[PDB]
Design a binder for this molecule. Structure first.
Ligand SMILES: *[C@@H]1O[C@H](CO)[C@@H](O[C@@H]2O[C@H](CO)[C@@H](O)[C@H](O)[C@H]2NC(C)=O)[C@H](O)[C@H]1NC(C)=O
Ligand SMILES: *[C@@H]1O[C@H](CO)[C@@H](O[C@@H]2O[C@H](CO)[C@@H](O)[C@H](O)[C@H]2NC(C)=O)[C@H](O)[C@H]1NC(C)=O
Ligand SMILES: CC(=O)N[C@@H]1[C@@H](O)[C@H](O)[C@@H](CO)O[C@H]1O
Ligand SMILES: *[C@@H]1O[C@H](CO)[C@@H](O)[C@H](O)[C@H]1NC(C)=O
Ligand SMILES: *[C@@H]1O[C@H](CO)[C@@H](O)[C@H](O)[C@H]1NC(C)=O
Ligand SMILES: *[C@@H]1O[C@H](CO)[C@@H](O)[C@H](O)[C@H]1NC(C)=O
Ligand SMILES: *[C@@H]1O[C@H](CO)[C@@H](O)[C@H](O)[C@H]1NC(C)=O
Ligand SMILES: *[C@@H]1O[C@H](CO)[C@@H](O)[C@H](O)[C@H]1NC(C)=O
Ligand SMILES: *[C@@H]1O[C@H](CO)[C@@H](O)[C@H](O)[C@H]1NC(C)=O
Ligand SMILES: *[C@@H]1O[C@H](CO)[C@@H](O)[C@H](O)[C@H]1NC(C)=O
Ligand SMILES: *[C@@H]1O[C@H](CO)[C@@H](O)[C@H](O)[C@H]1NC(C)=O
Ligand SMILES: *[C@@H]1O[C@H](CO)[C@@H](O)[C@H](O)[C@H]1NC(C)=O
Ligand SMILES: *[C@@H]1O[C@H](CO)[C@@H](O)[C@H](O)[C@H]1NC(C)=O
Ligand SMILES: *[C@@H]1O[C@H](CO)[C@@H](O)[C@H](O)[C@H]1NC(C)=O
Lengths: 318, 237, 203, 426
């Protein structure tokens, strides 16, 4: 069929008609952003030449290639720690939440740390359950328990002190009064909050409950992060499967070439495997540089979303 | 260094860049944000700063009642910038790394001229002096293929690095529009604090913003209330 | 006469264990839902190799003959099961129509209620045999569903095969060079397959 | 590290100087239990043989061969080859083991050796120098003939039929007397499958039925089907094998390897360094197991500080005071209980104007590379070959020119946001 772009709506305009909203809903729209790749480094001599001395000598004729590949992947790897740190480490001190939870009826228990669990929140545990040859994977600098201490500090500052923990030292303020500032920050007179406080708290608590239900009912929400995990695994499996390719050589098993032929003919056949595996590794590193630039744009966006949306109240529409 | 590699001058000389940072700065000082929105309108700097205090929700009288102090804190903080920049090069790690990445890329591209790629020599005149045409073409094809692959590697990494530098130039252009020509309300966009103003200073391959920010200090605890009863009616601030 | 192959005639393509994984391979396979010639026999072509099966409760089908001529001029396979042991030999044999039951040489070797199924192929001079056995209910046609055939014999005898015949309910189909996707379970048995050329969903 | 950076000064940091790779402690070979050896007793130990001037050959196939014993056998007083030596033949395999055996006068048998000469090698028992193997002979005057002479023997294709019944006599020496001999030439007929003991849990080089590699062989819970010999991971990589002499399954782990990173303060500050063996276990290499790898030459510390040199998995290292490199779990910052309650607010009574510097790059060094001069160095002979690659050099000049013009635009978009050159008052 020819697609519909949406329901047709003649807006009821006239020079003297206005529509004013008599009520609201607190929405809690989840947004999900990539921040870091799987940090990787490839021992390109062990990838290309498989710990063969006869091949390893031929790879020296190519000079700096199997060294600027490591410098490129090391630049990407250090950049993943920078991306992760630019996003989460926007906080000077690890703020912690009081023992009592007198937040005016708002219920953060599903997003605050669970000490019975790493000490992640309930929703962070759903999010962590939903996502699922010379190549080496390197750990992030911040462990998942350190990332959870930063999201805890950001969240505990955000709850107990508003935007103030971004602009200076965290200044405590009651959460009903912080939300009364958030209402003025959208041009809604703050008595609208205090007069509807139980209703607004219930709409927030219920909207948080719908996040748990949504994240339990479908994996499709985390498509962005699962796509990043899938692209990393697809790239690494493609890079490994390319070791099985001939590139015109007598065999893709380097020990066959070194046993089926005299050394003069073997060097020509090995140089096809070196050329093909080196082109394969250059192709992988080039794709990872372009993909790391995409993830860095997403990490700079996530870092900006944390500065404006978490540490502040952005007036930037959508 | 002669090997077809050439460095071209920028269109703007560092003196022309310094005339632009001078013009941006002289506009910013004498006229506030107005020189971005139209013609520069003069305004006294103690009145521009009271508009800039009012733009972070700090009432104008907080500047005038503290003008000597606020001026001394700005002058002293500019002194700490001179002392920091005079003391250590480590502040400019971003710009000196951009210079290093390009120098390492060019030195890698030059050192790759010495690589054999499977040819009898990496010196092209050795091949052409030692070998007759039909043999020489086979060795020169290896050098052409290797040097061409080395130059495609260089240009690919320079295209990706130019996209990174353009993302930074678009960010610097946005910081100049919003932090210099205006007062950004975007939290932590113009330095950590409630932003007042910023001054561009030129630097080789880059720009430096001196983000003047109000940072609050010396807080006291108080009892607080959302609203206050009077004649049975609730009052809100 | 003919019957539908359904998903029958898949076999373990190589001597490799794989588990909980899907492997895509191109080999001489019986194509899914192809038509299989039914017999109750004459000399037949061998083509790119053969799937052979019989619905049984009696053991009347005892063996096979293969070659170019299947007679005198060149080395020709005789394969027989006699319930004492399997016999294989490759002589320049001579007989009547066959040495069937009335109820030079270069190599030799020794080793309805049910279906017996087999595959016969020849690559790089390796003549290969696979088999499987299962109980059945239907007598008229090959049973629906899936169970992969597993190797029995793998001989470097180097003979050229273009014809074959059976030695005395039985079915013959031809293998074709096709991509299949094979599903290996947790124990490394093949439990399902896709003929990639069958339909757009299989592609 | 100095050599890795091509520098005599090293700045503070962590540098991947090398790759650690556990070497194979020894080499395994496994093949199936040796069987189906060709019955050469029918050649050398049987009670009779054909007359050598009328002999014929036959081919062994689908078999092993006793050539490793034959290379040191007492069954001949003499031997010779037209092919490779018998010690090489015992290490090889062929399409078939073509061979023949016969009785002759000793010198007439020698006149039919592979690559020899005489009416035997010419026609009675042919022996061209192209014969793909070896032959052997010994005296036999007690058994190769009667008391009346070599009537059981003969004299004059390879190893097959000027010939007549032999003139040898039982009273003669080994050249003139009756003798027994055989000859052969060269897949389906192979030398024996010599196999080692098995070695679990060490890193070893291995051969299993012609699969080869370096790994740690481990006993395993995998259940291969009776016809399966090897196991493979998702991306083709072999991850188990059946031992061909005792049919249990060995799981193969790679020999441990990883980046070696040197952690250093600047060479201004010290010559002392610590070494991280990334992802390696300290049992395989002060010593400290981090989650990032084994760390050597740094002190594990229970305090926490800001991250100076990043090791990974929450660990950082730094140089501290009497001085050493320490390693510690990084401090994310001091913890703070914000003094929250439903009626407490903190209000700042003062401020600091903070002039936070921010530094942004804006333009690269504008480069253009003349790709004909870079690739071909003002050689005409090279430049004509570079034309066969077509548009590539023009496309590279276009790409670098796009980057170069873009640096002027990047610089223009940052600074030229002001329409007029404003000036400051006196
Ligand atoms: C905050 O909300 C959570 C659920 O989002 C409430 O926790 C549940 O409370 C009921 C009744 O005590 C228990 O049966 C459930 O097992 C609890 N669920 C979990 C996941 O703990 C919690 O009681 C609310 N807190 C307040 C103060 O209202
Ligand atoms: C504003 O809208 C909310 C729903 O978003 C209304 O709240 C519901 O009110 C009905 C009774 O009228 C209850 O059954 C529901 O349980 C309430 N929902 C929630 C989330 O509390 C509210 O009544 C509306 N207010 C006005 C003045 O129109
Ligand atoms: C080729 C061959 O079978 N040679 C055998 C030899 O191995 C054995 O040792 C001997 C009896 O001692 O008889 C002969
Ligand atoms: C506010 O009061 C609490 C005790 O009620 C104290 O712990 C906290 O340090 C005080 N904060 C400031 C900024 O004075
Ligand atoms: C061959 O098989 C198809 C189903 O795959 C069937 O439609 C067709 O009729 C068969 N042909 C014959 C001759 O039976
Ligand atoms: C059956 O075959 C075996 C060899 O597999 C042979 O020894 C036996 O004599 C045969 N018996 C009959 C009755 O053919
Ligand atoms: C066997 O082969 C020989 C030639 O090697 C030939 O003379 C003979 O006729 C053949 N006999 C049969 C039955 O094939
Ligand atoms: C088999 O066929 C090939 C050509 O396809 C031929 O070279 C070879 O000699 C043949 N071998 C036999 C045993 O018929
Ligand atoms: C695997 O095989 C064993 C018997 O060898 C059987 O008990 C088990 O149920 C099988 N498991 C699966 C997943 O097929
Ligand atoms: C190999 O021989 C040994 C005895 O030498 C025996 O214990 C082992 O079971 C045999 N293995 C096979 C696979 O036959
Ligand atoms: C290292 O020494 C040089 C002089 O040799 C000095 O200029 C530089 O500032 C020193 N740096 C550090 C971090 O000590
Ligand atoms: C490998 O490292 C772990 C700690 O990560 C340690 O418990 C174990 O003993 C090490 N392995 C060996 C064989 O020592
Ligand atoms: C450091 O921590 C370990 C336990 O992790 C403990 O045994 C040791 O006594 C501690 N030492 C100091 C100086 O805190
Ligand atoms: C505010 O802070 C400054 C130092 O930043 C200090 O000199 C001044 O006396 C303080 N003023 C008050 C009212 O506390």
């Amino acid at each position: 069929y020819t697609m519909s772009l949406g329901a047709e709506n003649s807006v009821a305009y006239s020079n003297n008609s206005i529509a004013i909203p008599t009520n609201f809903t607190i929405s809690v729209t989840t947004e999900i952003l990539p921040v870091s790749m799987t940090k990787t480094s490839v021992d390109c001599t062990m990838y290309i030449c498989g710990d063969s001395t006869e091949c390893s000598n031929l790879l020296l004729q190519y000079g700096s290639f199997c060294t600027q590949l490591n410098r490129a992947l090391t630049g990407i790897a250090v950049e993943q720690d920078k991306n992760t740190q630019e996003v989460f480490a926007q906080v000077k001190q690890i703020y912690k939440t009081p023992p009592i939870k007198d937040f005016g009826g708002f219920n953060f228990s599903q997003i605050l740390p669970d000490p019975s669990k790493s000490k992640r929140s309930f929703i962070e545990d759903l999010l962590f359950n939903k996502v699922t040859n010379g190549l080496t994977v390197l750990p992030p600098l911040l462990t998942d328990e350190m990332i959870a201490q930063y999201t805890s500090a950001l969240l505990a500052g955000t709850i107990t002190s508003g935007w103030t923990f971004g602009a200076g030292a965290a200044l405590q303020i009651p959460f009903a009064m912080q939300m009364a500032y958030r209402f003025n920050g959208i041009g809604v007179t703050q008595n609208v909050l205090y007069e509807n406080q139980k209703l607004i708290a219930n709409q927030f608590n219920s909207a948080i409950g719908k996040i748990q239900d949504s994240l339990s009912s479908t994996a499709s929400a985390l498509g962005k992060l699962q796509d990043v995990v899938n692209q990393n695994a697809q790239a690494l499996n493609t890079l490994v499967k390319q070791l099985s390719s001939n590139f015109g050589a007598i065999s893709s098993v380097l020990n066959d070439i070194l046993s089926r032929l005299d050394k003069v003919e073997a060097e020509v056949q090995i140089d096809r495997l070196i050329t093909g595996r080196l082109q394969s590794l250059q192709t992988y590193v080039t794709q990872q540089l372009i993909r790391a630039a995409e993830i860095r744009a997403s990490a700079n966006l996530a870092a900006t979303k944390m500065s404006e949306c978490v540490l502040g109240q952005s007036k930037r529409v959508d | 260094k002669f090997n077809g590699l050439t460095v071209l001058p920028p269109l703007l000389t560092d003196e022309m860049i310094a005339q632009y940072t001078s013009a941006l700065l002289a506009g910013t000082i004498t006229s506030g944000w107005t020189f971005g929105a139209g013609a520069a309108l003069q305004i006294p700097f103690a009145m521009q700063m009271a508009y800039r205090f009012n733009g972070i929700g700090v009432t104008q009288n907080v500047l005038y009642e503290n003008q000597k102090l606020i001026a001394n804190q700005f002058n002293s903080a500019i002194g700490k910038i001179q002392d920091s920049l005079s003391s250590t090069a480590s502040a400019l790690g971003k710009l000196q790394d951009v210079v290093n990445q390009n120098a390492q890329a060019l030195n890698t591209l030059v050192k790759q001229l010495s690589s054999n790629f499977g040819a009898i020599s990496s010196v092209l005149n050795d091949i052409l002096s030692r070998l007759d045409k039909v043999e020489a073409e086979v060795q020169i094809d290896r050098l052409i293929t290797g040097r061409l692959q080395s130059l495609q590697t260089y240009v690919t990494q320079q295209l990706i690095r130019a996209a990174e530098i353009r993302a930074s130039a678009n960010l610097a252009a946005t910081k100049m529009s919003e932090c210099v020509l205006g007062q950004s309300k975007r939290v932590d966009f113009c330095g950590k604090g409630y932003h007042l103003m910023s001054f561009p200073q030129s630097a080789p391959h880059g720009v430096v913003f001196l983000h003047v920010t109000y940072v609050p200090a010396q807080e006291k605890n108080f009892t607080t209330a959302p609203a206050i009863c009077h004649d049975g009616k609730a009052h809100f601030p | 006469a003919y019957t539908n192959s359904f998903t029958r005639g898949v076999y373990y393509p190589d001597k490799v264990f794989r588990s909980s994984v899907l492997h895509s391979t191109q080999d001489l396979f019986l194509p899914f839902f192809s038509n299989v010639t039914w017999f109750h026999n004459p000399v037949l072509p061998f083509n790119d190799g053969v799937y052979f099966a019989s619905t049984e409760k009696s053991n009347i089908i005892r063996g096979w003959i293969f070659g170019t001529t299947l007679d005198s001029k060149t080395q020709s396979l005789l394969i027989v099961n006699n319930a004492t042991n399997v016999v294989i030999k490759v002589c320049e044999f001579q007989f009547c129509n066959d040495p069937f039951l009335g109820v030079n040489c270069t190599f030799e070797y020794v080793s309805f209620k049910n279906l017996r199924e087999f595959v016969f192929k020849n690559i790089d001079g390796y003549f290969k045999i696979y088999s499987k056995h299962t109980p059945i209910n239907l007598v008229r046609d090959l049973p629906q569903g899936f169970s992969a055939l597993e190797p029995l014999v793998d001989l470097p005898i180097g003979i050229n095969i273009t014809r074959f015949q059976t030695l005395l309910a039985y079915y013959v189909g031809y293998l074709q060079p096709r991509t299949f996707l094979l599903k290996y379970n947790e124990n490394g048995t093949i439990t399902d397959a896709v003929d990639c050329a069958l339909d757009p969903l299989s592609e | 590290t100095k050599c890795t950076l091509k520098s005599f000064t090293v700045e503070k940091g962590i540098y991947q100087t090398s790759n650690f790779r556990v070497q194979p402690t020894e080499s395994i070979v496994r093949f199936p239990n040796i069987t189906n050896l060709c019955p050469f007793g029918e050649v050398f130990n049987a009670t009779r043989f054909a007359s050598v001037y009328a002999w014929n050959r036959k081919r062994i196939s689908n078999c092993v061969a006793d050539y490793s014993v034959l290379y040191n056998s007492a069954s001949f007083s003499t031997f010779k080859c037209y092919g490779v030596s018998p010690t090489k033949l015992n290490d090889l395999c062929f399409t078939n083991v073509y061979a023949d055996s016969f009785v002759i006068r000793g010198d007439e048998v020698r006149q039919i050796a592979p690559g020899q000469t005489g009416k035997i090698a010419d026609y009675n028992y042919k022996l061209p120098d192209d014969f793909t193997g070896c032959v052997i002979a010994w005296n036999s005057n007690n058994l190769d003939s009667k008391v009346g002479g070599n009537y059981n023997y003969l004299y004059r294709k390879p190893f097959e039929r000027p010939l007549q019944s032999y003139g040898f006599q039982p009273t003669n020496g080994v050249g003139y007397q009756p003798y027994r001999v055989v000859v052969l030439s060269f897949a389906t007929v192979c030398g024996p499958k010599k196999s080692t003991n098995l070695v679990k849990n060490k890193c070893v080089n291995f051969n299993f039925n012609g699969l080869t590699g370096t790994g740690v062989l481990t006993e395993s819970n995998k259940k291969f089907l009776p016809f399966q010999q090897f196991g493979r991971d998702i991306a083709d990589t072999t991850d188990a094998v059946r031992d061909p002499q005792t049919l249990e399954i060995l799981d193969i782990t790679p020999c441990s390897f990883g980046g070696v990173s040197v952690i250093t303060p600047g060479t201004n500050t010290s010559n002392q360094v610590a070494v991280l063996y990334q992802g390696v276990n300290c049992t395989e290499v002060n010593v400290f197991q981090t989650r990032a790898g084994c760390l050597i030459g740094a002190e594990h510390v229970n305090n926490s500080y800001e991250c100076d040199i990043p090791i990974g998995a929450g660990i950082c290292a730094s140089y501290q005071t009497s001085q050493s490199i320490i390693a510690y779990t990084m401090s994310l910052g001091a913890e703070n209980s914000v003094a929250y309650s439903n009626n407490s607010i903190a209000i700042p009574t003062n401020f600091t104007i903070s002039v936070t510097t921010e530094i942004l790059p804006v333009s690269m060094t504008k480069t253009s590379v003349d790709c004909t001069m870079y690739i071909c160095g003002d050689s005409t002979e090279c430049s004509n070959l570079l034309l066969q690659y077509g548009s590539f050099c023009t496309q590279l000049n276009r790409a670098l020119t796009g980057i170069a013009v873009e640096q002027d635009k990047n610089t223009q978009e940052v600074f030229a946001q002001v329409k007029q050159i404003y000036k400051t008052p006196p």
